[PDB]
Write a protein that binds this ligand. Sequence first.
Ligand SMILES: NC(=O)c1ccc[n+]([C@@H]2O[C@H](COP(=O)([O-])OP(=O)(O)OC[C@H]3O[C@@H](n4cnc5c(N)ncnc54)[C@H](OP(=O)(O)O)[C@@H]3O)[C@@H](O)[C@H]2O)c1
Ligand SMILES: NC(=O)c1ccc[n+]([C@@H]2O[C@H](COP(=O)([O-])OP(=O)(O)OC[C@H]3O[C@@H](n4cnc5c(N)ncnc54)[C@H](OP(=O)(O)O)[C@@H]3O)[C@@H](O)[C@H]2O)c1
Lengths: 202, 202
Amino acid sequence: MRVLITGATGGLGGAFARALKGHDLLLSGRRAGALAELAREVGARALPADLADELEAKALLEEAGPLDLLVHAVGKAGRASVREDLVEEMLAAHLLTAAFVLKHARFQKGARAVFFGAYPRYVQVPGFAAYAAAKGALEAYLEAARKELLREGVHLVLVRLPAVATGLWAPLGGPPKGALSPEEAARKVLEGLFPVPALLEV
Amino acid sequence: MRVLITGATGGLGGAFARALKGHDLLLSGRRAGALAELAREVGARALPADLADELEAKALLEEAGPLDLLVHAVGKAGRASVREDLVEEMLAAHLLTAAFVLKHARFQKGARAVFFGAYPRYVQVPGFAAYAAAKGALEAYLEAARKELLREGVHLVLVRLPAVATGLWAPLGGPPKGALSPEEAARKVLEGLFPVPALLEV
Ligand SMILES: NC(=O)c1ccc[n+]([C@@H]2O[C@H](COP(=O)([O-])OP(=O)(O)OC[C@H]3O[C@@H](n4cnc5c(N)ncnc54)[C@H](OP(=O)(O)O)[C@@H]3O)[C@@H](O)[C@H]2O)c1
Ligand SMILES: NC(=O)c1ccc[n+]([C@@H]2O[C@H](COP(=O)([O-])OP(=O)(O)OC[C@H]3O[C@@H](n4cnc5c(N)ncnc54)[C@H](OP(=O)(O)O)[C@@H]3O)[C@@H](O)[C@H]2O)c1
């Protein structure tokens, strides 16, 4: 399959990249150095970019060509009260990257496009309003776009993951207790994706 | 009560302004001319501003002083597919205005701050992804900020209104069939706000 993994330089992205290395893989991220080495390690193509910049997102997708699978493991985290530019940074990282990618992506019929939201009860708490808002927006955006994409034969998949041990938690003091290994989260997602008709009578 | 109605020049905002004219009312909007006349009509103070500009939002709230009630009747509408800057405009109009206002607002203990979200099943449909996302973000932002504000003795109220006949639908071809009159929507909201203990034994 032709696979594009954005956020490839992140915790989840890297797990997905190694789990899918047998495919025609394209990896994208902001840290070019880290990106190039991972791509080389898994035999993929490295195409660095800032997906919050629509022109860069557009050039990435036009270059990638028709995709069978897209995994947008893009995001950023932050903690702050609403009473004292985090909101804009969060929306840019989570929503704009996804919106620009989804708008310019070339898809094969039957393709799947995976995005990551969040369990409402877990993020909609003091200190995470900005993050919660960004994910609330992303999920709403995708649900609305759902029928539009299906018309093109593309299936949008919204993933809700529990805490995962990655660098995302760096500015938050590290992952919480019991956070899944990124490899395990990717395995479960890929497993959630893996029922085909046994008999087709035309 | 000291009341601030942002989006006062809009359909809902105007209804709220006329319904609350007996109070110490402050009205804000972008169209200065329309704003000044409504304010004069209801004996309120007119303070025009672009709430997507944080410095303007900050100056408005510092000038308004401690509020007993805030009604953020701010927003914009638009229709577009996700496959072909609406998303950023929607987030700015619905979320950033609310976030900047909520951050700099001065509140009296017991104050209420009203915001407008949307019924998910109604907006999360083809053509309204951007709008849906903005409202999805706003509701998530507020739910998270809920406990933070309660600590200050402030109650955040999230309102979900059905279609209402206002200029919001202008770029969409006009309000749908059965859309409520803005006056009726405001009456119901104000009614939803209006149970006090009859006996307090200290
Ligand atoms: N980790 C968790 O506990 C958890 C839980 C629920 C959902 N999620 C979501 O899962 C996804 C991946 O999270 P993660 O744990 O892998 O975070 P991560 O380790 O910090 O990786 C984040 C990725 O996003 C990329 N990115 C950020 N801004 C970008 C931009 N403007 N343009 C292009 N790429 C950008 C980063 O690229 P660079 O590093 O190269 O700059 C990085 O590759 C995110 O949507 C996250 O919100 C995570
Ligand atoms: N109408 C409906 O069917 C419906 C349904 C559900 C929810 N809602 C929500 O209810 C609220 C009011 O809607 P409405 O029907 O009254 O819309 P409306 O008639 O178009 O009024 C919108 C108001 O938002 C103000 N505004 C927009 N951008 C602004 C900015 N950047 N800075 C400051 N003010 C800004 C506009 O000011 P100017 O006109 O002066 O530029 C106007 O006062 C919105 O949140 C809307 O999404 C409406």
